[model samples]
Target: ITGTSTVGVGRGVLGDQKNINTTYSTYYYLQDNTRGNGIFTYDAKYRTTLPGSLWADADNQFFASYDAPAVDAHYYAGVTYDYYKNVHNRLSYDGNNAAIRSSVHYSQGYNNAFWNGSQMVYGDGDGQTFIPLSGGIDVVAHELTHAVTDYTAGLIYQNESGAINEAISDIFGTLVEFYANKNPDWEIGEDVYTPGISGDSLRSMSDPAKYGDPDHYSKRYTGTQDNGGVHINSGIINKAAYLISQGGTHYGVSVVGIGRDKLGKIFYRALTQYLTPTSNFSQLRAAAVQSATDLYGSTSQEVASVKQAFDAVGVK
Candidate 1:
């Protein structure tokens, strides 16, 4: 949208009021030029097609029921963009100020969201399992982080590499949630998971086993389901990451807390400077150790905790 940058007021899927960056041509469009090239949001109109029409509003005020998803999708993409730029010193998802695009209302009864290599896509859940995926900042960041992974590590989406990809998304997703300071917790998708079921989430990073995900390397699923259990096996790495930040003991191995900022720095460095498409769990441990050592030192507590966290998760 080639027009003057503007601000719009709106209510997100959670009925929270917030302001979004929009553009005004003939009508107000959900095109934000405040960050990167632009952050664009579209209306999928319950179809499976890619980015649908660039959402247009007669007024810069969005409060309609149908406009809820677009409001959050557009707003949260901006937040994710900010997280990368301000927190990681990366520009957009590509580290090159690449334009970000998203489409909401992807399909009727859709229950998931994803980054389709180029743009973000969100589903208006069947109103049972989910409401609008973008309502969860972590969900939005998780999808956007996939784009980051694609541009940086280029980790293959299969087996061990794929599990690392999923864990990385979860790690950054949770960090973005904490960064936003909106009901932050160690649970993933709790804000948008089961509407009727309170106090539960799609997964738990603090304790992946709470949702039946393996939290230790010895318990990893070896079956061929779920791309060799990419989503399931991710619990192992997720637990390790959680321990690295918060400090915990698993299998009698203990780690000292290093906090979230250092966790983000270590993982960000590993993702950008060390990880490869085919890197497995052991390689990820090495990457994190090297990353921590690079940031701190070999004998620093940061590096030592990195080793202990991986050891607690039995990654070695």
Candidate 2:
């Protein structure tokens, strides 16, 4: 039997028919898809089937049995939607009550997922090294945040603009992870890969050094690897935000930090509401610091921590 439910503004599922049996049947209807006052429609037939016998059982198994991709996609979209509405007080992707569509199981054994300007697409991994792109909340948030970046700064995707584009996504993506409290550590992409792999997280915000990449801006790290390694190099900015949140020494140099709530507000305001297409690292740093000062006053410790965090990350 097919049924429908309404996802409300506060992450509450309203109306009757809340429970459904099949995953695919459920998501096809719930996806927002820019319709009906920007609410979701979770149809039944839209879900993807298992890729192989590994998932054919569909009852019990570890990695390959369940419809993990669709479940992850739906959960991430719902979380992103709530993040925008509750945290930022902005409705939908454009803050104009527009609905956003997300599609899962995009292609056969596809390795990556991305936001192609409008919608978010996922791949049902090869099931060898990676399982599914939608399995991770941060990965899902990362793609959607790309849309947010496109709408706000429209970052040029080259040099610092490219890094800023990546960094902003990572910043908000991590926030979504923390917001959900999906894992205990607040890391990114922890669920996309199998546990057998070692040091498997896509990136680390709290400790960039764990990735073996320079934590600050350096001449050595540049060029087009994963769109200028925008995903990889984003560790610097992510660490900056992490340091700001934890009230720790900025890059082990500047002694400053801010409360987590204030830090989050400053970054969110600077990225979505204040930034522009032409903004560079220095410009971003200046704007972010200004945002802190304006929101919490010039002499506030929050402002100092924001500035220290930027400087520690080599923003100048």
Best by lDDT: 1
Candidate 2 vs. true structure, TM-score: 0.79
Residue pairs with backbone overlap in model 2: 24-47, 25-43, 25-44, 28-43, 29-41, 29-42, 29-43, 30-41, 30-42, 225-229
| lDDT of every predicted structure (CA atoms) | 0.94, 0.64
TM-score of 1: 0.99
**Per-residue accuracy of model 2 over 1-316 as CA lDDT, tens digit each:** 1333333211111111122112223333333433324433121122443221111112221122234455456556777778777888867677676656566666677777777776777776677656667667788888888887787778877666777787787777878777877463546676776546866676777777676755787622676666666666667777778778875665466646665567668987888767887777788888788888889999988888877887787876
Off by over 4 Å in 1: none
lDDT string for model 1 (184-296, tens) is 99889998898999899999999999989999999999899999999999999999999999997888999998999999999999999999999999999999999999999
User: How many clashes in each structure?
Assistant: 0, 10
**How far is 260's C-alpha from truth in model 2 (Å)?**
3.1
